[model samples]
Target chain A: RLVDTDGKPIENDGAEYYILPSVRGKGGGLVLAKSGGEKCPLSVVQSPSELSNGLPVRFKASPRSKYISVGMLLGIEVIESPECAPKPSMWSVKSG
Target chain B: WKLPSVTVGNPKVSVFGGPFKIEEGKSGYKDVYSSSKGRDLDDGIEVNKKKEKRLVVKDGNPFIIRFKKSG
Candidate 1:
């Protein structure tokens, strides 16, 4: 059962979900988790449009984007292995 | 189409690293994950011996997020 910032259930209709910074002034097009390398499971970083993984991307067009609402806490998947596999473990934001 | 199922777990990733900037002609901000690839601690020491290195925040820092229409 996935929930959004408003605590409403999120429909998993094959829609790609993006974990973005909740703050308005804060920028970072989308959050991406890189795969592979010696830097196993680096911290999730914000990027305008860098390469990404686990989600789908269009060849000719820009990458797809779905966002969480402001003030809504959410969870994200982060790769933990040095190999940076396609799927990662779940991590959630705690309420302040 | 059905997607493949994958299982992932800890040691989880960290966000304690820099909040660097993003510049043109280069990648985003990148830093190492908290594992044993570098440095030495009892647990991480074993990891360093294994030699695992990944990049996070490859470009600059604090860039913007853009959303696109779904097909």
Candidate 2:
């Protein structure tokens, strides 16, 4: 349910994607990355907001729970992993 | 004699940015990516978990990351 700058659905066919921060100002704006051996991919869904709609991105885990428990901390780092990566561990043109 | 019809007044304003989605913590929502020892985690893109570079969501809005579609 996500869209790109061109206003289109974000592809989600087990494709890799790099995420950047939408909100930017002050000391903010970056991508979501990790530094772990095992990982899980976050599922993207359409926004359920009645006020607005698009892709209200969220994260879920697998092989742990029906939904794997994923969390976001308060820091940023360089994303360089394909082996020690979440599912769909690389970015592509259609994955925005 | 003649008369003119009245219409609504128009005003001008400036705006910036686009629609962004934000999610808040729900009641009892505790499924966080934590280590076995109970440490916060990133989305699994880093190389070293012991490094202090955890993914951060600033206060006041739901955490959002942009996709550049960069292949």
Candidate 3:
């Protein structure tokens, strides 16, 4: 569950933001309420071979989860599957 | 085996009391039914297909994150 600095649920009014995956083994990953971009319920894909070009899996943002404050980024870093690893520095976002 | 009774309705149908017999060289029997209780059937079918094609990507830790802009 994600919460803002004030500990409030994030309101997804089509806000534009960046979605970056954290480095694994770094002990940093949080469940986000929204994808933090134009696309609500972002898609995630796991690949068995190359780390890049993985398919996208859709995740529904928790309405109860709080949003990350501006100027601050939400950090998530956990490999959903052993085969697929987060592409370092691969960040996606939309205009805020 | 003996044969069972067959029933049908405007929105549904049922078969019962049959001897449960299978004839040779026959395509066999099948039961078909329909309902409008919920949303459109086509929509349901489309959703099911989408689910099947749904892709699941595995990224190292930090699948998603939020970043604040620099002032």
Candidate 4:
């Protein structure tokens, strides 16, 4: 279980969230499911010009089992300094 | 004139003195007599007999003392 540093959940809003699966050797893929649903391949949602506030997000994965180890990386983007617009450092990365 | 007097001599010592020493030929007899007393006394008598045997056998031999379980 993970939450944003502000103690908010990650959800759809224009915020870019991702679930990357860790694979070893030759076979595996990332899985995503809604709360309590069967895992499906990860999908790219609508990208936003900037991060949004109060977004809730989560990620999950299911490997083929033949693989030794399986895991997923869930992340979200946050606007670091809104005042400093169009700057790289103005955006920061966060995981949930 | 005649005088009345008392005379004192050394305490008597028997040839077989101190505690009775069992001779080699009479040891078996002594063991039999002690055995009838009770189990504890019989065990004490047997322990002394074993000590004597071990002393004779170990006269000049260096030995290691150890606690041994006897089956």
Scored by lDDT, the top model is 1
The top-ranked prediction according to TM-score is 2
lDDT of 3: 0.21
Give the Å error, residue A65, model 2: 23
lDDT of 1 by residue, B1-71 (tens): 11111112334433222111111111211111222244211100001212211112211232222223233
Worst 10 residues of 1 chain A by lDDT: A56-65
TM-score of chain A of each: 0.32, 0.27, 0.19, 0.18
Per-residue accuracy of model 3 over A1-96 as CA lDDT, tens digit each:
333223343333223222222233322222111212312323222222222323221212323333422222222222222222222212121112
lDDT of candidate 3 at residue A23, scale 0 to 100: 34
Could you tell me the TM-score of candidate 3?
Answer: 0.19
Question: Per the 3 Å backbone cut-off, how many clashing residue pairs does candidate 3 have?
Answer: 36
Best candidate, DockQ: 2
Whose DockQ is higher: candidate 2's or candidate 3's? 2
lDDT of 4 by residue, A1-96 (tens): 222223244332233333111112311111111111213211111112112121222221122221111112111122231222222211111111
Specify the CAPRI tier of model 1: incorrect
Error (Å) of candidate 3 at residue A17 is 1.9
